[PDB]
Design a protein around this nucleic acid. Structure first.
Ligand SMILES: C#CCOc1ccc(C[C@H]2NC[C@H](O)[C@H]2OC(C)=O)cc1
Ligand SMILES: [K+]
Ligand SMILES: [K+]
Ligand SMILES: [K+]
Ligand SMILES: [K+]
Ligand SMILES: [K+]
Ligand SMILES: [K+]
Ligand SMILES: [K+]
Ligand SMILES: [K+]
Ligand SMILES: [Mg+2]
Ligand SMILES: [Mg+2]
Ligand SMILES: [Mg+2]
Ligand SMILES: [Mg+2]
Ligand SMILES: [Mg+2]
Ligand SMILES: [Mg+2]
Ligand SMILES: [Mg+2]
Ligand SMILES: [Mg+2]
Ligand SMILES: [Mg+2]
Ligand SMILES: [Mg+2]
Ligand SMILES: [Mg+2]
Ligand SMILES: [Mg+2]
Ligand SMILES: [Mg+2]
Ligand SMILES: [Mg+2]
Ligand SMILES: [Mg+2]
Ligand SMILES: [Mg+2]
Ligand SMILES: [Mg+2]
Ligand SMILES: [Mg+2]
Ligand SMILES: [Mg+2]
Ligand SMILES: [Mg+2]
Ligand SMILES: [Mg+2]
Ligand SMILES: [Mg+2]
Ligand SMILES: [Mg+2]
Ligand SMILES: [Mg+2]
Ligand SMILES: [Mg+2]
Ligand SMILES: [Mg+2]
Ligand SMILES: [Mg+2]
Ligand SMILES: [Mg+2]
Ligand SMILES: [Mg+2]
Ligand SMILES: [Mg+2]
Ligand SMILES: [Mg+2]
Ligand SMILES: [Mg+2]
Ligand SMILES: [Mg+2]
Ligand SMILES: [Mg+2]
Ligand SMILES: [Mg+2]
Ligand SMILES: [Mg+2]
Ligand SMILES: [Mg+2]
Ligand SMILES: [Mg+2]
Ligand SMILES: [Mg+2]
Ligand SMILES: [Mg+2]
Ligand SMILES: [Mg+2]
Ligand SMILES: [Mg+2]
Ligand SMILES: [Mg+2]
Ligand SMILES: [Mg+2]
Ligand SMILES: [Mg+2]
Ligand SMILES: [Mg+2]
Ligand SMILES: [Mg+2]
Ligand SMILES: [Mg+2]
Ligand SMILES: [Mg+2]
Ligand SMILES: [Mg+2]
Ligand SMILES: [Mg+2]
Ligand SMILES: [Mg+2]
Ligand SMILES: [Mg+2]
Ligand SMILES: [Mg+2]
Ligand SMILES: [Mg+2]
Ligand SMILES: [Mg+2]
Ligand SMILES: [Mg+2]
Ligand SMILES: [Mg+2]
Ligand SMILES: [Mg+2]
Ligand code: NA
Ligand code: NA
Ligand code: NA
Ligand code: NA
Ligand code: NA
Ligand code: NA
Lengths: 404, 186
RNA sequence: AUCGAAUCGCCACCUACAAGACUGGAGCUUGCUCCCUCGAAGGCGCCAAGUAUAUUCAUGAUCACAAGACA
RNA sequence: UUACGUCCCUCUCCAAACGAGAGAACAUGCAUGGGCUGGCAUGAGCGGCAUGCUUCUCCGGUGGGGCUCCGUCCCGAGGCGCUGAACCUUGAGGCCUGAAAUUCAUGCUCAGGGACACU
RNA sequence: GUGGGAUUGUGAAGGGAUCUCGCAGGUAUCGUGAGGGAAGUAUGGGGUAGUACGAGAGGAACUCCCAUGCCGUGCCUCUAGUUUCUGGGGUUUGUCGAACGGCAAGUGCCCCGAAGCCAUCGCACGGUGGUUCUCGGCUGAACGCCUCUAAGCCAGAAGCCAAUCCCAAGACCAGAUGCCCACU
RNA sequence: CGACGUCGCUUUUUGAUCCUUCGAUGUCGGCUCUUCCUAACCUAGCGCCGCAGAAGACGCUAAGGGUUGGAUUGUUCACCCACUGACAGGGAACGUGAGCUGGGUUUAGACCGUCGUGAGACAGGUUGGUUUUACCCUACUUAGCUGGAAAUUGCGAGAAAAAGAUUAUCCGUGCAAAGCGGACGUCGGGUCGUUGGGCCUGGCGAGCGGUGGGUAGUACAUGGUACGCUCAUCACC
RNA sequence: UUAAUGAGAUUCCCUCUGUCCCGAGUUACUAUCUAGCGAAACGACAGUCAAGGGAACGGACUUGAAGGGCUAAGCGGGGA
RNA sequence: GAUGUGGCCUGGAGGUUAGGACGAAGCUUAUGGCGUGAGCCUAAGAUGGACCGGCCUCUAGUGCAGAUCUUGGUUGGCGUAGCAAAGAUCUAACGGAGAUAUACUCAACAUGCAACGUUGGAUACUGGAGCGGGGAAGGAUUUCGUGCCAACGGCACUCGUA
RNA sequence: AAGUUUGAAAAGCACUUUGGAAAGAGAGUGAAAUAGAACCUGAAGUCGUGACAAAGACAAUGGAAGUACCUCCAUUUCAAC
C-alpha cells in the first residue's frame, strides 16, 4: 500500500557512490568553454586552505533592505604561492574522446617536482628526468621537441600546461608534504597557435594567482571534503531517529525495502563512508587577492580601517600557522579542512547576475584570536589594555640594571 | 632499506664514499650560492636592498639559508655505553582524555617507551622512586610533568651473541619544571 | 629459444566520391533521334620476364597435412 | 636475472574499525624549554605603620569581637599588599626558528634495519 | 636453447631418460571517458497599477528587482550546544597529626572553560543547450475552390536527451610521460 | 450534463470459488523508509466556455517535483480546528513485526447484561495479560588484494597509428603536390655478403650537449634554479 | 450512598522536562585489532535479475539482461 | 499390480570336487576382461597372516539412500559467536627450562615475544547486615607438610580445594 | 560403555645425541615395529602433503559424440608376415 504521508527523500542520488575520493587534491573534471575571441589565459590555480575569518563591507545592490548598509560576511583565506609551469600537453579530438598527442617538458625541472615520482626521495638515486635532460638540447632532441610542437599546431584542439605547487615557498610547518602537487591547466582563448605561444613563454616560469583571477570575480572550487570515516544513516543521509522505545537501537532506517523486489534498492540509506568526497563548488566571490607579507605587510589594512595588520590572526591560524605568501580571500566557505590543497577554477556558470557582478570593497577585516573569543585586533591593542605585566617588569629590570 | 643503500651489500668503505659524495656535492652548491648572493647584494642599490631582507643570511635570529639545520650539526661520535641523562617528560600531553583507571599504568608504559626510544634499549627498569612518584596521587592523579634520570648500563648474559644494554630510570624531585632542559649529567 | 605447428591472393592501376525517379554527351519532339569511349569486366597473378630456338626434374616407386610457403 | 625501485619496521596526521590513504625518510624530524595566543580570576608564604608595598624623596597599610599583663602583647572568619598573580596552553596531535618587532633557544640521531625486486 | 625443480610406495652412492616451470617486464606520475548515477523545486513582496476590462461593484499579468519555503552539497569566522584539556577556580563529607600537596565519593558537586565536533539554533553555494508532446501556424495538394498535412517547413511543455555535477578502463585506453631492465 | 437504453474498462470494495500452504508463509493500525502507477490536487505548457475583468468550469500533453500541523477514536475510515501553491487517488504478500510498537483483535484471571436447570455461551460491554534467534548465502552499503583480449591457453598476428629500395635507405617544409631548405669529418683495422656494401672497433680533430672548477651581471617570490665567459670530465662517437 | 485507604481503570489543570519540533556533544563497557581459548543453531544441492508459463508468487525451466576472482566491517530486502 | 527366470548375491547344512606359508579371509584400485543387468572373474598391492573356492541339493535373523529411523564416528559453520556485573593494578629483587635464545652483515632499537610464584615497596578495594571470626544442615579428608605439572582449575600458572 | 586380539617368545627398544620434560634423531630386539603396550587386520567419511590437470564469471553433478594429453591395463603383429 502507498505511504501514509509524503516527504522528500533523504540525500542526493547524483553524488553516488558515497566512497572515498580517488585523490586528495581537487581536480577540475571540466574546464570553462573555450572561446577563441579572447586572448590566451590560464583557467585554474592551486591554493592551500589556511583558515576562516569575517569581514565588513557595504552592500551596493539597489532595492534591498541592506542597500548602502554594512554587512558581516564570513570568508575563507587560501594561501596561493606562485605556480611553476613545467610542461605542455596537446589533445586531439577523436570519435572516442580526447587523446594526448605528446608532452613537451621544460629543459629544467625543480627538485620538488621530481620528488613526486618517488616514495622515498632522500634515500633514492634521484635519477628522474636525467636521460631526458641529456637527450634534450641535442640534435635529435631539439628535432623531437619541434616535431611534437608542430603536431600540437596541426592536430590539437585543446592545449594544457603542466603546473606544480612550490612547497618550499609555502614554508608551512604543518603541511608535511615536500613533493609538489602536479595538475594540468587548460589554456583557453585565442587560436591553437596562440595557445602554444603562451604555453611556450610560460615554460620554467612562475605564475601568480592574481594573473589568473581578479579581485571582484567569482570562481569555482574543486576540493575534497573532510573525512569522517564510517557513519550511520542518521548522519550520512539525514534520516529521522526512531523513538526511544525502539528495541535494538534508534539510529537506523526502520524499513530498508518492501517484500518485492526481493532486494535492497540502491536508493536506500545505508551506513558507510562519510566525507572525503570530491566536490565542485560554484560561484565563490573573490573578496581580496592579497600580496605576500614580505612585500606588503599591511594585508588586512583597508581605506576605512587604518590599523597596520596582516591577514594572519592574533595567535596564528589554528593548526595551520602564518600566511607567508600571496593569498585569496573567498566569500563563504569551501569544502575540505585546513592545509589541504585546492583548485580554483574560472567559473563555468553564467556570471550575469547582480550579485555576481557586484564590486566588492572591504571596510574591515577581523584579525582577532581564533583561539577562545578574541577581543583584540592587534598585539598593540592588547598591550594598551593590560599595560606592563609582572613578566615585563622582570625582563625590563634585568635589562635596565644588570645589563646597564 | 633499498638494495642500493644497504650497508651489508654495499660494504662499509663503499657506504662511506657515497655519503661523502652527497656531502661534497651539496656543500659545494651551498658555497656557489653564498658567493653569488654575497656578490649581487653588494651590487644592488640601497633602495633595492630594503626589499631583500634575510636573503644573504643578514637577518638576526634566523636559520642558515644555505643548508639544513641537521647538516650543520657537529657529529661528535658514538656515545659511551654508560651514559646518564636528565630529562623532563610532559606526561599530561600523552594522557589527555585517557580512561581514569588506567592512567598510572599507562604512564609507566609511556615513560618506558620514551626512554627506550632515546637510549635504544628494550630493558628499561623503573626505580622505586619513579614508580612511587607516578602513583603518589592515585591511579588517575598522575602529575603533568616528571623529571627523570636515565642511566644506561652494559651487561650481557654469558654465551649471548649480542651485547645487552639496559636503563635505570629514577625520579628527580624539582620544585618547579620551568626552565629545565635535557642535560647529559655525569 | 623452446617452436614442430592450423591459415594457402598479390598490388605503389581496387584501396576517392555520389546517385539508382535515371550519372557518357547532345537535340527537341520529353521519349524518341543523334554523336561517342556504343553504357554488362580494378589491374595483375596460375611455371620461358613471355608465346618461341628452349631447358634439371624420376627410385618421394599409385591417395595420404603442399615432404613447401617472403609472390 | 642485474639495476631502478616497492613494501614491512620507524616517525607524522589533511586519512582511518582493520586494511587502505596522505606524508616524512638526519628532516626545527622529534624532545624539553622560552616567547605568543588564550583559559581561570589573584597561588604558596610572609607582613602592617618598616624591617613591607608602591613611586621618584613622596605615597599605602584592616577586622565584628575576645584574652593576658592607660598602654602593651596575643586568639579571631573575613580583608589588604607583594599579585591580572599562580596554574594550564597540543595532546586524536594551537602559533613563533623566513615581513618587521625580547619574540625564538638548546638537546637527540653518528653506515637506518628487514624483505622482495631476482627460476 | 638456457635456468630452476621433480619422478611411484621395500636400502646406499653414482649415471641416463622423461616430465613441469621461468626466460621481460617492473615501478611512479599526468590524463582520456564508454557506461552508470544524476537535482534543484516552489511561494511571496516591489513595480507594472487601482492600469487593462467593466455601467458600477470590482480588478489582472509578463520583462526586471528584492526576499522566502522545501530540498541538496558543504563549512566552523560569528552565535548557540557539548568538556575526561577532570584546564582554572570554588565547595560538602571522609582521610594522610596540621599547613602545603592532595586523595576517596566508579568524573563528589557547582561556576567558568580552549581545541575538536556540531545546529536551517549559525554561515556559504546550488548553471546550459537541444529533441520532441499537446497545440498554434506557413506553404500546399488530393478535390480547378478549400484545407496546419499528405510530401515539405516554423514555433514550441516543470516531460525526454546531452552539457555542468559524481563514480569511473571487466570500456581491458596502440592515451601521454619519468626512471631502470630486457631486446637491439 | 445526459433520463430511457446500450457497450466497455479496472482489481484500491465486497461477494463467489477452494488451485497453493495446516511435520506453521507471524493477523489490524500506526511509526520509519524507498520505489512504482496515473483515472492530474498543486507546479509547466496548451485548447474551449452560458470567456468582459477577477474568480472559475470542461478538456489535452505531461508522474520531473510537491502534496502539511493538530483535537476525539486502537482504529482503517470519519469529523472538526488551522496553515498552504495544494493539502490527489492508489500499488508494492490488504509493502514494511529476526525493523519497532502492542492500543485493538483472539488463551488462561475477573466483573456486568442477556441466554442456559447446569457446566458454560455471546461478530455484546469491561479490566489485566512473556513480541525469541543472524556469525550462513544472496541483496545493499562502504572497505582491501588481484590477475586477465583465444577473457587464464595458440606460437590464433586486426592500432579511431604512420606512409615506402614492400614502410628498410636519413630531417624539416608543402596538399599522400609542385618544389624548396638542411645534414660533422678524416686516417686505419677486423669481420661477413655489387654499390662511394653491412656490421664491429681504434687514433686525430669539430659540433650539439650532460655534470663539476673558476669567474660577471641579470631574471624570477628573495636559499635556488637558469643564463654569459673559461677550464676539466663524460656522452652522441 | 459513602469519609479513609489503593503498585486498581479513566479525564483535566499547575509544575516539569530531549516525549516531540530536530537533533548535537561527551563517558564506561562492548563491537572493532591482537595473544591465549574456543562453541552452537543450522546445513537436500546451491545461491545475480526481468518477464513468461508452471501446483495460479522460481535459485534451477523458456527467452532475454547481467556476471573476472578472492576478501574485511556492517545490514536486515529475499532465502514464502 | 500379477507372474516367470539351468536369473544375481549373503550366513549356515547334506553331498561332490578343489585351493592355501611358493601366502587363506578381509581390504585397496585411471587392473582390465566378461555379462543388457543383478554381478562374476583375472591382474597388482612396494596389503594381510590362516583359512577357503566351484557345482548339486537343503535351510534361513538372506540384499538398504532416505522411516524428524538406531548406535558410533566425522563434518561445513569456524579459529567464527564469544570468554564485557562484582572498580586494579604498578615496581624492583629473588626463584624458575620458561632467556638478554641470531647464518652472514652487524654498537645497542629496528630479529625470543608474551606470560608465571614469593618477598619488600606503591596504589586501591571489602567498610563490622565484611571476599572478617565461629557453628547447624549438607558435604567427608577438601585440613597439614613435602614433592610434582600428563589431564583438570573454559586465559595462564613455577600456583591449587589437581 | 568396555574383546588387554602386541609378539611364537618380552626378546617390551640397552646405549649415543638434542630437549626442562614430553619427545625427536640414531642405534638395537624381532620373520615382521607400518606388531612399540589398550599395540592383529586397519575400511568408509574427513583432513595434510608432493606431483600433475587445468579452470573466468554459466552452482556443481549428468547425457551423447569427438578431440588433446596421459596410461604400473588388455590384446594383436613384427616378413613378401
Ligand atoms: C486467525 C486468523 C486469520 O489470519 C491468519 C493469519 C495467519 C495465518 C497463518 C497462515 N498464513 C499462511 C499459512 O497457511 C499459514 O502460515 C503459518 C505460519 O502457519 C492464518 C490466518
Ligand atoms: K551520461
Ligand atoms: K537517467
Ligand atoms: K584496462
Ligand atoms: K496452514
Ligand atoms: K496548469
Ligand atoms: K467478552
Ligand atoms: K537369459
Ligand atoms: K549419530
Ligand atoms: Mg501518495
Ligand atoms: Mg506507511
Ligand atoms: Mg503503507
Ligand atoms: Mg520493547
Ligand atoms: Mg526487550
Ligand atoms: Mg576558535
Ligand atoms: Mg582508601
Ligand atoms: Mg558550559
Ligand atoms: Mg476479488
Ligand atoms: Mg484457500
Ligand atoms: Mg517460519
Ligand atoms: Mg512449509
Ligand atoms: Mg518470512
Ligand atoms: Mg493522463
Ligand atoms: Mg507530475
Ligand atoms: Mg517520480
Ligand atoms: Mg501487510
Ligand atoms: Mg492488492
Ligand atoms: Mg517480531
Ligand atoms: Mg505489525
Ligand atoms: Mg520482515
Ligand atoms: Mg494489547
Ligand atoms: Mg438463570
Ligand atoms: Mg482483553
Ligand atoms: Mg478477558
Ligand atoms: Mg498488570
Ligand atoms: Mg592469453
Ligand atoms: Mg525472478
Ligand atoms: Mg533476511
Ligand atoms: Mg543485526
Ligand atoms: Mg543366521
Ligand atoms: Mg565345498
Ligand atoms: Mg592406484
Ligand atoms: Mg579413483
Ligand atoms: Mg559364489
Ligand atoms: Mg532382516
Ligand atoms: Mg549402509
Ligand atoms: Mg533424518
Ligand atoms: Mg573445523
Ligand atoms: Mg572474535
Ligand atoms: Mg557477553
Ligand atoms: Mg570485572
Ligand atoms: Mg609485589
Ligand atoms: Mg634483540
Ligand atoms: Mg623476554
Ligand atoms: Mg572504600
Ligand atoms: Mg563502595
Ligand atoms: Mg559499624
Ligand atoms: Mg562475614
Ligand atoms: Mg591446602
Ligand atoms: Mg585453562
Ligand atoms: Mg635383524
Ligand atoms: Mg602393515
Ligand atoms: Mg602386524
Ligand atoms: Mg594395528
Ligand atoms: Mg580413510
Ligand atoms: Mg591426496
Ligand atoms: Mg548448470
Ligand atoms: Mg574425453
Ligand atoms: Na577514550
Ligand atoms: Na561556545
Ligand atoms: Na492495587
Ligand atoms: Na527456493
Ligand atoms: Na536462464
Ligand atoms: Na573480551
Amino acid at each position: 500500500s502507498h505511504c501514509k504521508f509524503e516527504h522528500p527523500r533523504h540525500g542526493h542520488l547524483g553524488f553516488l557512490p558515497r566512497k572515498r575520493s580517488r585523490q586528495i587534491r581537487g581536480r577540475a573534471r571540466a574546464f570553462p568553454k573555450d572561446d577563441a575571441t579572447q586572448k590566451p589565459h590560464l583557467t585554474s590555480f592551486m591554493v592551500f586552505k589556511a583558515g576562516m575569518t569575517h569581514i565588513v563591507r557595504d552592500v551596493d545592490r539597489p532595492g534591498s533592505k541592506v542597500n548602502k548598509k554594512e554587512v558581516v560576511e564570513p570568508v575563507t583565506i587560501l594561501e596561493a604561492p606562485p605556480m611553476v609551469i613545467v610542461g605542455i600537453v596537446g589533445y586531439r579530438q577523436t570519435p572516442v574522446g580526447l587523446k594526448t598527442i605528446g608532452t613537451v617538458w621544460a629543459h629544467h625541472t625543480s627538485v620538488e617536482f621530481r620528488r613526486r615520482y618517488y616514495k622515498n626521495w632522500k634515500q633514492s638515486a634521484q635519477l628522474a628526468f636525467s636521460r631526458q635532460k641529456q637527450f634534450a638540447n641535442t640534435k635529435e632532441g631539439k628535432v623531437a621537441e619541434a616535431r611534437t610542437l608542430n603536431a600540437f599546431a596541426k592536430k590539437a584542439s585543446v592545449i594544457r600546461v603542466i603546473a606544480h605547487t612550490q612547497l618550499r615557498k609555502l614554508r608551512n610547518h604543518r603541511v608535511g608534504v615536500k613533493k609538489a602537487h602536479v595538475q594540468e591547466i587548460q589554456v583557453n582563448g585565442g587560436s591553437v597557435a596562440a595557445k602554444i605561444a603562451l604555453a611556450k613563454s610560460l615554460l620554467e616560469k612562475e605564475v601568480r594567482v592574481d594573473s589568473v583571477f581578479q579581485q571582484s570575480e567569482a570562481c569555482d572550487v574543486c576540493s575534497v571534503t573532510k573525512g569522517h570515516g564510517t557513519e550511520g544513516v542518521v548522519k550520512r543521509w539525514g534520516v529521522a531517529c526512531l523513538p526511544r522505545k525502539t528495541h535494538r537501537g534508534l539510529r537506523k532506517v526502520a524499513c530498508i525495502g518492501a517484500w518485492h523486489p526481493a532486494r535492497v534498492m540502491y536508493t536506500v540509506a545505508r551506513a558507510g563512508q562519510h566525507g572525503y568526497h570530491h566536490r565542485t563548488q560554484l560561484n565563490k566571490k573573490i573578496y581580496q587577492i592579497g600580496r605576500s607579507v614580505a612585500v606588503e605587510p599591511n594585508q588586512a589594512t583597508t581605506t576605512y580601517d587604518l590599523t597596520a595588520k596582516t591577514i594572519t590572526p592574533m595567535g596564528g591560524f589554528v593548526g595551520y600557522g602564518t600566511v607567508r605568501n600571496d593569498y585569496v580571500m573567498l566569500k563563504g566557505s569551501v569544502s575540505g579542512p585546513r592545509r589541504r590543497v585546492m583548485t580554483l577554477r574560472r567559473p563555468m556558470a553564467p556570471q550575469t547576475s547582480r550579485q555576481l557582478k557586484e564590486k566588492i570593497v572591504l571596510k574591515f577585516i577581523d584579525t582577532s584570536s581564533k583561539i577562545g573569543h578574541g577581543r583584540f585586533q592587534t598585539k598593540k591593542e592588547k598591550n594598551q589594555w593590560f599595560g606592563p605585566l609582572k613578566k615585563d617588569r622582570i625582563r625590563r629590570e634585568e635589562r635596565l640594571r644588570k645589563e646597564r | 632499506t633499498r638494495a642500493g643503500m644497504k650497508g651489508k651489500v654495499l660494504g662499509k668503505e663503499k657506504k662511506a664514499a657515497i655519503i661523502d659524495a652527497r656531502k661534497k656535492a651539496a656543500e659545494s652548491r651551498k658555497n656557489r650560492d653564498d658567493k653569488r648572493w654575497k656578490r649581487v647584494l653588494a651590487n644592488m642599490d640601497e633602495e633595492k636592498r630594503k626589499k631583500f631582507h634575510g636573503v644573504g643570511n643578514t637577518a638576526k635570529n634566523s636559520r642558515v639559508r644555505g643548508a639544513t639545520r641537521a647538516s650543520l650539526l657537529k657529529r661528535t661520535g658514538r656515545k659511551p655505553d654508560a651514559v646518564s641523562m636528565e630529562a623532563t617528560i610532559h606526561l599530561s600531553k600523552l594522557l589527555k582524555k585517557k580512561t581514569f583507571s588506567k592512567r598510572a599504568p599507562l604512564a609507566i608504559k609511556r615513560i618506558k617507551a620514551f626512554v627506550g626510544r632515546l637510549m635504544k634499549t628494550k630493558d628499561n627498569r623503573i626505580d622505586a622512586s619513579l614508580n612511587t612518584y607516578i602513583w603518589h596521587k592515585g591511579v588517575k592523579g598522575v602529575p603533568g610533568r616528571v623529571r627523570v634520570l636515565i642511566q644506561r648500563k652494559s651487561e650481557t648474559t654469558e654465551g649471548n651473541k649480542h651485547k645487552h644494554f639496559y636503563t635505570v630510570i629514577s625520579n628527580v624531585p624539582v620544585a618547579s619544571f620551568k626552565g629545565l632542559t635535557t642535560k647529559t649529567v655525569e
